[PDB]
Design a binder for this molecule. Structure first.
Ligand SMILES: [Ca+2]
Length: 554
């Protein structure tokens, strides 16, 4: 097993992690000076969100130069220092790779758009409109049509995401070669990993025919069905990742779960592991903003299916939070004062005992919660603006209805400044933060929790150590004890004759758990919200509200 199967990752959204110069935006020197903190927590590797030159219409995901560092984060020297300081700590760096699209301010697009006949025309998708409208009926994730007309040439360009995020043309060999050289630029600097943003949408459908009514309903899935997708991913592995020791992780958004093995089966020489969307969006509607009621049964059944697509040769990541989703404890736990800490601990136990490489999203180790928006403009984000364009301006929904749902689902919930201490703006900045800090920072902050052995932080820290010292908890088999149970999440992890039992009550009421026949408790490794460990030999557990536990069984 390669190092990454037993690693615990931490995701840093540098823009909201640590500001060191008072401009209100997190930067590299902030991250670097917090490495001791991350090492102390027990982190093996960090994935950072995009760190490249960008106009920031999508906070890093609209890249205007792949070979320069974003001005807000620092200089190339700062990046070099970050890597050096990670390596001194024995820690690895995974960077975000955004090559489905570039900023419209990238010099390639500026050149491409300039005329119909120039050497950069085919680095993007340019097409005549049809019948006085767009080339076809493709919608954008960020509002309106995915085609944007350019008065310079009178043709439309393709953008699945923002209008200022034109899609790169993977059908053009010279463009593919540019991407590979660019990736070598960073890999030559020693980065240890790459995460590929929307890796499944690289291939476009020949001829751009209209989406059928059915496909229009789930266009996200349709955009992942490009017929040259795996050809391209395989070429990239051959031309790039074969020549380095870096680990690769694809964000496979939109793709049906049964296709995931095509990305991660090691024999296929594409990616090493998968970020899948099934679990994190298990309670999201197809419109991507409405919530849908779900139970623990739905939660655990999704995990089981996702675990199954890995098989002997594939590998999954596991995460309950990221920069594109609401806060873990609010989303999956219960963020009310009486249950925030208890449920946050419970989800920690889950995260660090799943099969796959766990990714901890910044702030979740403190039990940070969703933000208490009012209306606009606490919601300033290109995605929400698109929801407004598609659903409110069109009369399909009111602003209150949109805001009611996006209060619960907006990715802005996960982008509020990390809560370091109880000083002004939670010690995140000495100025005014680009996004308001959650007022609960006075209670939920790192300085308070690091000194408290009962804290969510301390629990995550203890779990990370337990996972590090217990091979079965990383690479062991996974078996769900009862996929139909909507109250208590219970499963085993097993390897080399050693079996561990994980038991997590998802209700705020007492519950019981009968171990499967033949199985008894041998040792209790850890528990949360439990006044006392079970007796050695127990065939049953009595669970306090939101109790979690890890036990070795006999
Ligand atoms: Ca700054």
């Amino acid at each position: 097993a390669p190092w990454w199967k037993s690693a615990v990752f931490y995701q840093v959204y540098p823009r909201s992690f640590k500001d060191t110069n008072g401009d209100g935006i997190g930067d590299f020197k902030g991250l670097t000076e917090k490495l001791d903190y991350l090492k102390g927590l027990g982190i093996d590797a960090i994935w950072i969100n995009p760190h490249y030159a960008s106009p920031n219409t999508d906070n890093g995901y609209d890249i205007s130069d792949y070979r320069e560092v974003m001005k807000e984060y620092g200089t190339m020297e700062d990046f070099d220092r970050l890597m050096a300081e990670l390596k001194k700590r024995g820690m690895r760096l995974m960077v975000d790779v955004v090559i489905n699209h570039s900023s419209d301010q990238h010099e390639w697009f500026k050149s491409s758009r300039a005329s119909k006949d120039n050497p950069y025309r085919d680095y993007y998708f340019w097409r005549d409109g049809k019948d006085g409208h767009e080339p076809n009926n493709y919608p954008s994730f960020f509002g309106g049509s995915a085609w944007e007309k350019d008065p310079v040439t009178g043709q439309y360009y393709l953008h699945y995401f923002g209008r200022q995020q034109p899609d790169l043309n993977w059908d053009t060999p010279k463009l593919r070669e540019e991407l590979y050289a660019m990736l070598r630029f960073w890999l030559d600097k020693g980065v240890s990993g790459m995460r590929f943003d929307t890796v499944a949408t690289y291939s476009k459908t020949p001829g751009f025919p209209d989406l059928t009514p059915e496909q229009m309903k789930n266009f996200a899935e349709a955009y992942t069905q490009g017929p040259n997708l795996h050809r391209y991913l395989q070429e990239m592995h051959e031309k790039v990742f074969d020549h380095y020791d870096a680990v690769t992780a694809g964000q496979i958004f939109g793709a049906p779960l049964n296709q995931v093995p095509l990305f991660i089966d090691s024999r296929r020489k594409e990616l090493d592991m998968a970020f899948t969307f099934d679990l994190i969006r298990y309670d999201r509607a197809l419109d991507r903003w409405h919530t849908i009621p779900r139970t623990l049964a739905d939660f655990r059944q999704t995990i089981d299916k996702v675990d199954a697509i890995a098989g002997e040769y594939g590998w999954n990541t596991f995460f309950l939070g990221n920069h594109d989703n609401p806060r873990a404890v609010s989303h999956f736990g219960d963020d009310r004062p009486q249950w925030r800490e208890a449920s946050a601990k419970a989800l920690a136990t889950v995260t660090l005992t799943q099969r796959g490489t766990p990714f901890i999203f910044q702030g979740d180790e403190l039990g940070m919660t969703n933000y208490p928006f009012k209306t606009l403009q606490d919601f300033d984000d290109i995605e929400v603006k698109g929801f407004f364009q598609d659903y409110v301006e069109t009369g399909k929904a009111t602003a209150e209805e949109l805001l009611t749902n996006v209060a619960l689902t907006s990715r802005n919930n996960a982008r509020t400044p990390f809560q370091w201490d109880d000083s002004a703006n939670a010690g995140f900045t000495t100025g005014k933060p680009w996004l308001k800090v959650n007022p609960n920072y006075t209670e939920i902050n790192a300085a308070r929790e690091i000194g408290d052995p009962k804290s969510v932080y301390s629990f995550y820290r203890n779990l990370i150590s337990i996972r590090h010292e217990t091979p079965a908890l990383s690479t062991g088999s996974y078996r769900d004890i009862d996929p139909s149970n909507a109250d208590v999440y219970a499963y085993t992890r097993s390897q080399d004759g050693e079996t561990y039992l994980v038991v997590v009550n998802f209700k705020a009421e007492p519950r019981s758990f009968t171990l499967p026949d033949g199985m008894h408790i041998a040792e209790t490794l850890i528990e949360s919200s439990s006044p006392a460990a079970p007796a050695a030999g127990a065939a049953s557990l009595e669970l306090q509200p939101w109790q979690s536990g890890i036990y070795k069984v006999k």
